[PDB]
Design a protein around this ligand. Structure first.
Ligand SMILES: [Zn+2]
Lengths: 1340, 51, 70
């Protein structure tokens, strides 16, 4: 057992052993990006891969070729922290080595010269954080992994609704990774069609002619030959003894001196057994059977040299005679059978307007680009570029694999583009399914859905970046002079960097990190979407893809999906899932060899998994690991049933692997209706981080994995002991084993302190270890927000009791005791960023001066001489954060204003008041001020004080490093000097700086002292440069936008408590909005007097079948019971014996669990610290489907000395009398979600109005009035509310004249309206009148 | 026109792009006028731009 | 809210199953000659299904045929 486990150990129910512990939850995001940006000395996907495709680039056959060498990534311009404050994107410069060779004219190739131009710069490409996010403009963003249809060929249906005949249809689609689509589809008439892209439908055979196939080769390829001999006079026929199946005799069919079948008897198994066994090769026939047969090849008249019959022309009893008398012994015909081999391709040729190669190539060109004339060179080139160019087409390897896979080939890799064979083989396979042999695919199966993520999608955006630079490079290499231009002159930077900046900036897949919660971050980075580029659209599909598919078991979560307009269009990644080598979704299983269950694990992709028979998660195996029962519930080929002991090939890894990180965090999930479970893991992520990181009394076990794997916590790099612990930083003196030989030293973790999140919540780290405590590698060193002691604590649990409380929980509303708001415990800290801009207007420059017209010193108290609010000033609504004034001269005031200025003597100023002031109603403490000034404008007073202070702090920080790192390094020098010259007391008298001189006798210890010297002087110099650059960055001109001189950003720390209106919910989809905040006097209490924190409504529980919230409440009740027991014994100071005796009893409980525990923990100093951490309650773990059972809960209630009912009697705090019936009380972990009321509440009397439409508009955040849409008008129309409606869309909004006439009347105390006409309609009259239309208002 | 061209040679040459007071030196005039120039030089934006 | 979504599901599920259930009727009693083709009906089908009118041969066939046109 570890070090931050020894502190507090969660009692774990659940029997099934963990065989594989949860891997890094951010595996997907971090892995994929690492592959994209990395030197790979071969083709595997990456920047190397993208390059190698387009490169080498060569000029227009001018034999001036530009080839690609290799690429490097410059160091980040700013590091993570730096890049965020200023607002740059976190990127690295991409430097690629290019070689320009020139071939002589005319050349057996070889070069006059080649300049090997060093790494031209082509933009900066963003970099991924340590924790899987990007920074685009100082704002953390996530790139959502996408789910789209796998490249390859897929045969589909479109049954039923088509045409209202039933019949069904069958279509094939060739979907390449890049390049045009190739669609093959049937119709009711059983004609094969093709359409490129989604374009005009065309007769399918046209592509064969484009591949230089004439009519004869199409028949030869798609059809068999029925050879007709003219032997003697009039017609024999080659008979295949099989051809006659699925047909009836056409005539007197006889051969071999015996009539096998006469006219009119269908050729069945009898007739075909006879023919095949009797070897009937040749039969004599009438001249009329070829009346329908189609002649195969071309036959011309040997004498006149004229065409008798063109290939694919049907013969007639007269047509045969014309080619029979010409001496033609062979006539090849088509075998046509509408059950087995249908005359499909034959009919297609009859619909084709083309004939030769250029004939079809034109019809393809004129379809793609109608309106412009076809050409010989145009039509030929277009087709070769569509499916046969390495540049404009690629299936990739995965595309080639599924292609070969779906077609029953052997090669798993091959051509990257389609060949004449590839296209033909597909057309072949499509026909087979229509014949009844073979089945169609479905889009939904996760073996036909592929996962892309950041690493791949950036590659593609880089590839397009080059194709638009490639045109440009080829263009320059055409005319380029001799040895003057070099491969930098041609390659611009903006074109490359724009094509990649485009993606990470605005894309459906690049979004603001959902970061109010370590679960929210981790659940976002593990997310899928079938929307956006290359995926489905909400308006397209279509319920099948939204629905949960059987193949989702252990790959995609069935329960964690959004609840909105795109349900099932998102989904969330399952816990143990991983991405296949080929890019499919696989999941872990256990290899069941014969009847034993092994521990060697295998990853099976969606296609791989179907075949095998997989056992179940909850399956009892004992001793060697035989299946206990002779029959075990298992699932194999898409269904689930009971199976034999030794038929099972694999078994589920965990009881958990089907859900997501969100879903797995719900305790007693098994007991919760699936719908409400969705809402649970949906709202869990909306939990705003609390003031005091609690901890769930009722947990699942995952909370430690989510806290650590999410970056929010500070996890020990190397194991060792703590040298220094500050609320600011933590220094770890590394153990020797883990410590590297040189530079020695200590690991120093600088903590993140109070700072703004994306959702204005506060993200603050705190130290969770004390001075000189042992920590090992991979220990928890500091808690993030909403993490406690290494566990993920998204909220704070409290004492909850289910009962009606005089209606203050009517619907799902919640009733809360004052003790909660007094305890500041659901109090939540928010950080808003407010900025002031000094711009340039036509009239002049804005100044940030503190001289503000018509304001008293009351304002200028919180403002310094320069005009910026002081750090630390607690301000509320209206207080000025940054004084600002805009040039507006000669006001042209009116008489009565003029007379007023003369009576009271105000020097009517030539400057407007534009200062940044605190928004009405919100109130907090100023904790930081930043000033960004144009390069070359003089830093004002306060601005210079700040950039001086940032300097003094930065110098202190860097030197603190050196002081700790020196002493840490010198401390190692001291110990190696002691090994062969130990002068303990003699050594540390003299100045420590004067140590480097002491040497050592012949040994490696002489070479070891040598190592620490190098890295000392490097600390000495790396300090110097780290301090230097830091100093330049502060004074350097902060670069801004056009028109803007300087900007002040003020950061506020508002501390919001909790009030009626806030949305709160438990983890089981039980929402509720706190309704009244009650006095502790009025709360339900028990015979011990202890009030209850929340009073929930029992009605919310039966309807919404979330029964886990009750189990949670009871187990929570028992978990606090163990707490109350230890708290008494710890206050009794009973001594280790009485305490340890009681703790040991708790962690076993009944028998058969998985827990294990002491007495190993050092029976004193370690055992006591634990007891403390438990007195608040004993943390229990209910795994997802391995959870606790009622008996274990009731049993733990016994130990806590609490009733098994889970219910007690309560007393009304007001009347003091008993409550009839026992009520349930207990502890339920509850979240406060960030739909906090004082963010939702808006009101407006009279505000801003839109220019175009004189209509209430939000401008100063005194927001626009409520919108009164169509349906709200029918409301007033259904009442008689004629005036209420007029006023609603006249004076209250649209009537530019009426609104002021009204407001004046309102204050005069006359409630009337003088309405007139809405400007909305006034503009229509003009808008219509400005068309050719004379629209008037008639009459009177 | 001159201003777009100076930024080209100096786009890849200066790793990024020359400072607002660098092209000012390249160009013959008062060189603070670049701001004044660059302001009117922009085309207005389509009011019916989707947000 | 959301509760209704669950409600919706229950009504749908119930209706589909019910239709299926009815397609078996109840206490029937009759003869043994198949109405399609006269083949012998065994008392097993008579006692499993009260009122069976289709031999096992026809109780596939037709089912089979429907599938084919799908
Ligand atoms: Zn029958």
């Amino acid at each position: 057992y570890s070090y931050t486990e020894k502190k507090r150990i969660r009692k774990d129910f659940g029997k099934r052993p963990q065989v594989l512990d949860v891997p890094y939850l951010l595996s997907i995001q971090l892995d994929s990006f690492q592959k994209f940006i990395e030197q790979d000395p071969e083709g595997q996907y990456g920047l190397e891969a993208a390059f190698r495709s387009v490169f080498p680039i060569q000029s227009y056959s001018g034999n001036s070729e530009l080839q690609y060498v290799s690429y490097r990534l410059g160091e980040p311009v700013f590091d993570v922290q730096e890049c965020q404050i200023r607002g740059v994107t976190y990127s690295a410069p991409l430097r690629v080595k290019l070689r320009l060779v020139i071939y002589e004219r005319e050349a057996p190739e070889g070069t006059v010269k080649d300049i090997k131009e060093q790494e031209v710069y082509m933009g900066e490409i963003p970099l991924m954080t340590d924790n899987g996010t990007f920074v685009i403009n100082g704002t953390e963003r996530v790139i959502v992994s996408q789910l789209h249809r796998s490249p390859g060929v897929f045969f589909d249906s479109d049954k039923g609704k088509t045409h209202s005949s039933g019949k069904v249809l069958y279509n094939a689609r060739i979907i390449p990774y890049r390049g045009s689509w190739l669609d093959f589809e049937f119709d009711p008439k059983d004609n094969l069609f093709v359409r490129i892209d989604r374009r005009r439908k065309l007769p399918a055979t046209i592509i064969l002619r484009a591949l230089n196939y004439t009519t004869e080769q199409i028949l030869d390829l798609f059809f068999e030959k029925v050879i007709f001999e003219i032997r003697d006079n009039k017609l024999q026929m080659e008979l295949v003894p099989e051809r006659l199946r699925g047909e009836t005799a056409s005539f007197d069919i006889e051969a071999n001196g015996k009539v096998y079948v006469e006219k009119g008897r269908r050729i069945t198994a009898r007739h075909i057994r006879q023919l095949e066994k009797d070897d009937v090769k040749l039969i004599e026939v009438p001249v009329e059977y070829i009346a329908g047969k189609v002649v195969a090849k071309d036959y011309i008249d040997e004498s006149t040299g004229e065409l008798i019959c063109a290939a694919n022309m049907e013969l007639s009893l007269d047509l045969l005679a014309k080619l029979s008398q010409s001496g033609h012994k062979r006539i090849e015909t088509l075998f046509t059978n509408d059950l087995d081999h249908g005359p499909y391709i034959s009919e297609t040729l009859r619909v084709d307007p083309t004939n030769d190669r250029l004939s079809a190539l034109v019809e393809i060109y004129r379809m793609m680009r109608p309106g412009e004339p076809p050409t010989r060179e145009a039509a030929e080139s277009l087709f070769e570029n569509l499916f046969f160019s390495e540049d404009r087409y690629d299936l990739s390897a995965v595309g080639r694999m599924k292609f070969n896979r779906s077609l029953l080939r052997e090669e798993i890799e091959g051509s990257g583009i389609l060949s004449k064979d590839d296209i033909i083989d597909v057309m072949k396979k499509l026909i087979d399914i229509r014949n009844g042999k073979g089945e169609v695919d479905d889009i939904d199966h996760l073996g036909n859905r592929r996962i892309r993520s950041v690493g791949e999608m950036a590659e593609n955006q880089f590839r397009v970046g080059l194709v638009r630079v490639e045109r440009a490079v080829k263009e320059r290499l055409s005319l380029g002079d001799l040895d003057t231009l070099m491969p930098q002159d041609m390659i611009n930077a903006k074109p490359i960097s724009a094509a990649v900046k485009e993606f990470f900036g605005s894309s459906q897949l690049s979004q603001f990190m959902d970061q109010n919660n370590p679960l929210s971050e981790i659940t976002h980075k593990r997310r899928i979407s079938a929307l956006g580029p290359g995926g489905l659209t909400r308006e397209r599909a279509g319920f099948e893809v939204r629905d949960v598919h059987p193949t989702h078991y252990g790959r995609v979560c069935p329960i964690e999906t959004p609840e909105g307009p795109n349900i099932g269009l998102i989904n969330s990644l399952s816990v143990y899932a991983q991405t296949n080598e080929y890019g499919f979704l696989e999941t872990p299983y256990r290899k069941v060899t014969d009847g034993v269950v092994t521990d060697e694990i295998h990853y099976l992709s969606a296609i791989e998994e179907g075949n095998y028979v997989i056992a179940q998660a909850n399956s009892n195996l004992d001793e060697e690991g035989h299946f206990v029962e002779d029959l075990v519930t298992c699932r194999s080929k898409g269904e689930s049933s009971l199976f034999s002991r030794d038929q099972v090939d694999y078994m589920d890894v965990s009881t958990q692997q089907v859900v997501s990180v969100g879903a797995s965090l719900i305790p007693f999930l098994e007991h919760d209706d699936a719908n409400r479970a969705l809402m649970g893991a949906n709202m869990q992520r909306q939990a705003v981080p609390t003031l005091r990181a609690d901890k769930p009394l009722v947990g699942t076990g995952m909370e430690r994995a989510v806290a650590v794997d999410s970056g929010v916590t500070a996890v020990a790099k190397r194991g060792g002991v703590v040298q220094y612990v500050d609320a600011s930083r933590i220094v770890i003196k590394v153990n020797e084993d883990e410590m590297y030989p040189g530079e020695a030293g200590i690991d120093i973790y600088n903590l993140t302190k109070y700072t703004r999140s994306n959702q204005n919540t506060c993200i603050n780290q705190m130290p969770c270890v004390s001075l000189g405590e042992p920590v090992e590698r991979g220990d928890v060193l500091a808690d993030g927000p909403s993490t406690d002691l290494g566990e993920l604590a998204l909220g704070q649990n409290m004492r909850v009791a289910f009962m009606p409380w005089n209606g203050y929980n009517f619907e799902d509303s919640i009733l809360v005791s004052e003790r909660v708001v007094q305890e500041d415990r659901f109090t939540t800290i928010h950080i808003q960023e407010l900025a002031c801009v000094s711009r340039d207007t036509k009239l002049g420059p804005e100044e940030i001066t503190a001289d503000i017209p018509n304001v008293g010193e009351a304002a200028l108290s919180k403002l310094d001489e320069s005009g910026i609010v002081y750090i630390g000033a607690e301000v509320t609504g209206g207080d000025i954060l940054v004084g600002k004034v805009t040039p507006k001269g000669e006001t042209q005031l009116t008489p009565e204003e003029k007379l007023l200025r003369a009576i009271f003597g105000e020097k009517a100023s030539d400057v407007k008041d534009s200062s940044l002031r605190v928004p009405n109603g919100v109130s907090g403490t100023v904790i930081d001020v930043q000033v960004f000034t144009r390069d070359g404008v003089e830093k004002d007073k306060r601005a210079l004080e700040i950039e001086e202070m940032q300097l003094k702090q930065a110098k202190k920080d860097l030197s603190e490093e050196l002081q700790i790192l020196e002493a840490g390094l010198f401390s190692r020098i001291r110990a190696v000097l002691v090994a062969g010259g130990v002068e303990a007391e003699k050594l540390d008298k003299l100045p420590r700086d004067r140590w480097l001189e002491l040497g050592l006798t012949d040994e490696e210890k002489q070479n070891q002292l040598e190592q620490l010297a190098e890295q000392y002087d490097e600390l000495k110099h790396e300090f110097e440069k780290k301090l230097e650059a830091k100093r330049r960055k502060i004074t350097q001109g902060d670069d801004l936008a056009p028109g803007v001189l300087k900007i002040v950003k003020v950061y506020l720390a508002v501390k919001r408590r909790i009030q009626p209106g806030d949305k709160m919910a438990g983890r089981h989809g039980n929402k509720g909005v706190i309704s009244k905040i009650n006095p502790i006097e009025d709360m339900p209490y028990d015979e011990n007097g202890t009030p209850v924190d929340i009073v929930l409504n029992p009605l919310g529980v039966p309807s919404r079948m979330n029964i886990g919230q009750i189990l949670e409440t009871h187990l929570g009740m028992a978990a606090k019971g163990i707490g109350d027991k230890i708290n008494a014994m710890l206050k009794q100071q009973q001594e280790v014996a009485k305490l340890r005796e009681f703790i040991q009893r708790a962690y076993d409980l009944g028998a058969d669990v998985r827990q294990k525990v002491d007495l190993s923990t050092f029976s004193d100093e370690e055992v006591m610290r634990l007891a403390e951490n438990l007195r608040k309650g004993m943390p229990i773990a209910t795994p997802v489907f391995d959870g606790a059972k009622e008996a274990e809960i009731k049993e733990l209630l016994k130990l806590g000395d609490l009733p098994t009912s889970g219910q007690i009697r309560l007393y009304d705090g007001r009347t003091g009398e008993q409550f009839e019936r026992p009520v349930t009380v207990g502890y339920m972990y509850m979240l406060k979600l960030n739909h906090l009321v004082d963010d939702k509440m808006h009101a407006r009397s009279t505000g801003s109005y839109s220019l175009v439409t004189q209509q209430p508009l939000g401008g100063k955040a005194q927001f626009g009035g409520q919108r009164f849409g169509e349906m709200e008008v029918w409301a007033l129309e259904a009442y008689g509310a004629a005036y209420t409606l007029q006023e609603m869309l006249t004076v209250k909004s649209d009537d530019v004249n009426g609104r002021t006439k009204m407001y004046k009347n309102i204050v005069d105390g006359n409630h009337q309206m003088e309405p007139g006409m809405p400007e909305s309609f006034n503009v229509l009259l003009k808008e219509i009148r400005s068309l050719g239309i004379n629209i008037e208002l008639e009459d009177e | 026109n001159k201003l777009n061209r100076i930024s080209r040679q100096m786009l890849q040459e200066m790793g990024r792009e020359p400072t607002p007071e660098e092209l000012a030196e390249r160009m013959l005039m008062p060189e603070d006028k670049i701001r004044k120039v660059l302001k009117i030089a922009k085309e207005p934006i389509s009011m019916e731009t989707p947000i | 809210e959301a509760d209704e979504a669950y409600s919706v599901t229950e009504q749908l599920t119930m209706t589909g199953i019910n239709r299926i259930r009815q397609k078996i009727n109840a206490h029937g009693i009759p003869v043994y000659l198949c109405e399609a083709c006269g083949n012998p009906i065994p008392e097993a089908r008579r006692k499993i299904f009260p009122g069976v009118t289709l031999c096992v041969e026809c109780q596939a066939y037709q089912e089979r045929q429907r599938k084919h046109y799908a």
